[PDB]
Design a protein around this ligand. Structure first.
Ligand SMILES: NC(=O)c1ccc[n+]([C@@H]2O[C@H](COP(=O)([O-])OP(=O)(O)OC[C@H]3O[C@@H](n4cnc5c(N)ncnc54)[C@H](OP(=O)(O)O)[C@@H]3O)[C@@H](O)[C@H]2O)c1
Ligand SMILES: NC(=O)c1ccc[n+]([C@@H]2O[C@H](COP(=O)([O-])OP(=O)(O)OC[C@H]3O[C@@H](n4cnc5c(N)ncnc54)[C@H](OP(=O)(O)O)[C@@H]3O)[C@@H](O)[C@H]2O)c1
Ligand SMILES: NC(=O)c1ccc[n+]([C@@H]2O[C@H](COP(=O)([O-])OP(=O)(O)OC[C@H]3O[C@@H](n4cnc5c(N)ncnc54)[C@H](OP(=O)(O)O)[C@@H]3O)[C@@H](O)[C@H]2O)c1
Ligand SMILES: NC(=O)c1ccc[n+]([C@@H]2O[C@H](COP(=O)([O-])OP(=O)(O)OC[C@H]3O[C@@H](n4cnc5c(N)ncnc54)[C@H](OP(=O)(O)O)[C@@H]3O)[C@@H](O)[C@H]2O)c1
Lengths: 312, 308, 298, 335, 297
């Protein structure tokens, strides 16, 4: 019998997702790594329990997370049944379809076949009646967005997803998906782009404007550039990373914490989607919330060191 | 049973019209050879070979057998036995429109027949849904509004992922596209008879209507039920068409299929089989999909000369 | 589908040993012609004709097909389609003992094999229980106490109404009667190979063991697989002609000439063969002279 | 989809269990270690697939195997569903109740309450309608054997277990259990004692004679003394070993260097000889090995190539291999 | 989510029930009163939680406990589902049939009809596959004991009761029930008689000897004479021992290995806390046996 921390909602920051009434935790946990059948279930269990005890209420999955593909969703479903029986309604669970999942022409892409068949498999693996958020995981340029949109609408209409989202769509495609979903009277909830201090296509492309103009949330994935922004590649690269680490030290933050605080420095990002291989990493990362302020000078110096090391 | 791991290596897949659904260039139909009059072991060897060759689309109708219904039952049986892990790699269709059961609700295009028939097909196959449900033919006594709305209810209720029509004129096809658009459903596919010796589809303007509306085309009786495998002039022309195939290094069947697949106007050709070896032969059509301008003229000329 | 209303008018039924169960004098076996290699419509026409002739007993085993299990599955399908309203008018048997599935639990007489096999058979046929469950053969490496107790568990648990054995010697039969009596279950039936050209049953004393213990006898391969349909076979055919019978009919009548045999378990590949075979019942008498001449030729 | 090795039944030896018709593989796999939630499911899957591909058809479990308790049974149930859907009827699956499993007075021991509640939990964890063998896992001197026996009989009668067994019972208690089960017309199938070259209470006590006289099988547990009889601890304690994760207290001055020579002389590893030795007698039905990786199964099954020992060999072993003081289950067998 | 006290098994004493392997807590909770639909569910919840947190693992019910009849079993089923979902297998739950439950000739007594139909209703009310102990609740002199026994034996054989018991049977009828149940290879587990300082028919009749000789446990009911032995001259002896009167009355029953358990009631948690402290000092007619009709037959 497991009891979650009664103070779990006392310290975490929650942000409204775009114009919706759904509040996401400022840090969410992704299950891309460390939740496959290659990882011991006890290690996974400790991570999920610590995340919920820190008030992280959003867990982000996809069909092909593991390895092997599907295993994160299965393991998550097991831990849900064992430790989160009483807590499902306090969690926001997402899954996605778009990348290679199973063999053949219906195992990848953006067709109605793949999306709806995949959603069913994901709900069965996780033991859920519905996900909170179902995503088109990437752009499929060979499926008309009308078809992808109508699949997402069917997920909602049928009660298999409460809300829908997209991931790695250009601003123009995002705008088209908002419009197609509006024809079904469904608001696009959220957009999940890769976004970190060293990868700012989101800024440069004008995505954040499209999102804000349409009331769509933003959840940043690989916010630590998969560990590059943690301190653990040319000479100028390393020297810049060293200087960024020194800025983080000046702020009283690890490099990881400053990378997260930077994404969260303004309202433009709803949540950052962190990974963890152990509970202590969650404890460190959520402390990013203790220092979300950057001076104009700091923001310039950060961009400058990135310019100087050619980390763009 | 384990499907061939290399099954997706050689088959060609085509997007169905403007949709994201990729059909195999050759699909298997179950019109013949899958009734209760046919041994289940023979059926099993055919379906297993089809999937091993990368044929992912299996086309059924309520009344396929004989007797009526039995193709769907037998398929369902084999699906459970051998394809338990593979449903989501398959495109399965059924249809309603011809005589299936006695009386005024057993044929035609009414909401009663279509929906009651879809339910019977899902139960016989053991499926929650078909990938493609079709109106199997035109019913001039049911308003197309009723037929279209029945197809829409199928989609809405989760009993069919997509819908199609079979043997509709270009004008009726265009009206069905429009009626289904009112429901925000794109018509996926049209299934006409179409082969070297039967080109109403081209001449009527059907292929243009399909392409213009982003509807796929799957050719039924692509071998003219074996003719492409009778007066003197007919036979003599078929002999010459056979010789052109020989020149190409193809059987007549393979050339007949390649010809339909020579361009993007056809999504798929719907072949039958009574044994596994015929599937092996037919899919080799993909090795030679090119026809010169001269070849296409000579083919049409021999067809003209034999009055085929 | 409606069964012939006169189906009980002509068939002869015999009490199985001392029990109250009446079997038809001719029963249908599904050893051949009911596999996935045989079209279902042909199978359907055979079963409908058998029931229309009053044959109420259908004999199956786990490994009947081919492939193994397919007879039981095809039977289950036809039961559901055509015999939905008639299950309680039918006596259905199955068996375990021969090779069914790979490995050490897929053959023989163990509790593991018999009880697992029964479960698979009931699932393949779509039945809550069989009327008769059999040990299909002797397993000299499993103690009979184990085999018997498995059969008893089948009865106690409601998976089989009665139990039987097949191809057991008179001595092993007697032991199985005794082991089952310890459970207060009477052995219903013995199924031996028995025909004009294979009479170990007579020579061994089996029929006496069966009668003494009230156990029924159902003869399998009663036509020696079709052989009883060269110079001696010619003369046996001439005796059949003299009786106004086909050779097949005489072979069956011969087995049924005594109260010693409850039923003969025929196979059929088409309906017409059933129609011919049941007419054996029109001439069940043999003179002493005939019986001698038959033995003399054969 | 997964396909088992078609030749899986070509090399393994199967032995009739006592006087029953149940044939166990001469090597069985136990899930005491390496199948908990602390062990990756992929590693477990590779072990079970290799075991079945070698013809090992018997998997032995217990309620409290893991860690944590219950997790071996849950993981096994998952793998059964995923890889062995078509093969359940080719497997012999056991579980047990008798050690500490859950808190309180009903969570340990031999009572009808504990045994029947536990069997239900094991079936639910494994996703099975029944186990092939249900055991009383040890002696409980405070529960009358009549109660324990009757609980095992209810397991059989109700269809939750095909056969029943006992583990670590003295010859006298074994004999009583055979008698009490006979009153229910159930034959006791099997006895599971600790038995290896360095732990021979089974020989000394007369247990093998009791078992044969009652037609009861014998499945030898810790047949490698947990790894000690593998030689893996002759020149150091390896990183990837149970002892680094069974302690170095067991490596006393008191055998292994001598035994290793004898094994070399036979063309066997020490592990193989240890197994062959248990299997030299037709009264040992099987040896119940553990494995932390597939390669260990491949080595161990080759024990079956050399099951013969000369009088001299047996004499030297009896002379020169003293009790190892490693029977951690002696409490049960001394009652 | 509710978590039971992790030290719940640290203080309670457990006793083997007769010759069986089943260990009952020395104090068990009965639901005769205070668990009907006339009692707030929150109050009931606080009592059961405290009982378990003190290591009391046995809860004793009957079909007609309430009021109204059946309601204790229903309330208990609810609380089981809400707070004891993870703990069923740590609990010993009993029910009974024998007194008036429903109208008519099948609603009382010892017939196979009443006992088996009643067991099915009890299991449905409590949401349980089986009870740990099913009892014949009293003697029915108009049903042959062979019938009652066989009904108890069917409960066990069918998996609806793990063990069976009897309540308020004379020594002679107890002995007959032991013998009848042995013909089914079932040992009678337990006898539940009224027994307290002011009501000792159990001693005088020879029942404790019959029980011990047959390996049957004894669970004492109305051990506080319903509250009379709580205080609301004996009180002065209790004071001398450093005990409340209640504690001394319970200690007295538990002074011997003759009593497996004393079956207390409670209307609030604090009474459980007080009563279990009886275990700290186990060393040493009121005309109130309202269940004497049954024990006199
Ligand atoms: N939609 C998409 O296309 C997409 C693509 C990628 C990811 N994502 C999502 O985003 C999530 C985040 O991606 P990611 O795993 O690359 O996240 P990240 O936050 O970029 O890196 C996470 C990893 O960095 C390490 N780490 C985390 N906190 C740390 C700390 N305080 N100090 C040192 N190291 C630390 C851990 O790895 P070690 O255990 O190796 O130390 C952890 O597993 C995923 O789980 C997934 O759901 C989505
Ligand atoms: N317990 C055991 O060990 C065991 C072993 C074997 C059989 N059996 C049982 O015994 C049953 C009978 O075995 P069986 O099929 O060999 O029996 P059989 O009656 O000796 O031979 C039947 C076959 O003979 C042919 N036949 C039948 N009637 C005929 C007629 N009137 N005219 C011409 N040909 C005729 C048919 O074969 P064609 O028409 O194809 O030539 C038919 O399939 C089985 O179905 C089975 O249930 C049991
Ligand atoms: N009834 C009971 O009370 C009881 C008690 C104990 C056990 N058991 C049963 O008996 C089974 C076996 O117990 P056990 O695992 O201690 O038996 P074991 O066979 O004495 O020990 C097996 C361990 O030895 C190592 N090993 C095996 N083969 C090897 C080789 N060829 N080379 C090197 N190392 C090798 C492995 O450990 P590492 O690789 O991790 O070092 C493996 O996990 C249990 O799984 C359970 O089913 C029952
Ligand atoms: N088999 C049968 O025929 C039969 C018959 C009767 C009972 N029983 C069983 O035995 C159980 C016990 O019956 P019972 O409730 O009369 O038993 P009891 O132990 O004689 O009395 C319990 C009652 O005494 C009062 N009390 C308890 N502890 C106290 C304390 N420490 N200080 C002050 N007052 C205290 C409480 O009543 P207040 O707090 O409201 O005053 C409580 O409801 C029943 O629940 C039932 O399961 C069986």
């Amino acid at each position: 019998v497991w009891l979650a921390n009664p103070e779990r909602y006392g310290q975490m920051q929650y942000r409204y997702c775009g114009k919706s009434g759904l509040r996401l935790p400022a840090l969410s946990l992704g299950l891309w790594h460390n939740f496959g059948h290659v990882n011991a279930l006890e290690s996974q269990r400790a991570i999920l329990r610590k995340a919920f005890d820190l008030g992280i209420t959003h867990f982000d999955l996809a069909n092909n997370y593991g390895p092997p593909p599907g295993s994160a969703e299965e393991n998550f479903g097991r831990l849900l049944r064992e430790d989160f029986a009483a807590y499902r309604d306090e969690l926001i669970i997402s899954t996605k379809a778009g990348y290679d999942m199973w063999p053949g022409p219906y195992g990848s892409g953006g067709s109605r076949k793949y999306l709806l068949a995949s959603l069913d498999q994901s709900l069965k693996r996780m033991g859920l009646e519905y996900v909170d958020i179902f995503y088109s995981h990437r752009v499929d340029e060979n499926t008309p967005m009308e078809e992808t949109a109508s699949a997402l609408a069917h997920a909602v209409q049928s009660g298999k997803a409460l809300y829908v989202g997209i991931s790695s769509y250009s601003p123009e495609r995002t705008q088209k998906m908002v419009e197609l979903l509006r024809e079904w009277k469904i608001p696009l909830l959220i957009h999940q782009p890769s976004y970190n201090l060293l990868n700012r296509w989101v800024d440069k492309s004008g995505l954040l404007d499209t999102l804000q103009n349409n009331g769509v949330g933003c959840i940043a994935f690989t916010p630590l550039a998969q560990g590059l922004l943690t301190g653990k590649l040319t000479e100028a690269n390393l020297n810049s990373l060293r200087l960024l680490n020194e800025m983080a030290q000046q702020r009283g933050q690890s490099m990881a914490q400053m990378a997260l605080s930077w994404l969260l420095k303004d309202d433009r990002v709803t949540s950052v989607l962190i990974g963890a291989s152990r509970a202590e990493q969650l404890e460190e990362n959520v402390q990013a919330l203790n220092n979300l302020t950057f001076s104009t000078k700091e923001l310039a110096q950060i961009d400058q060191h990135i310019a100087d090391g050619e980390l763009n």
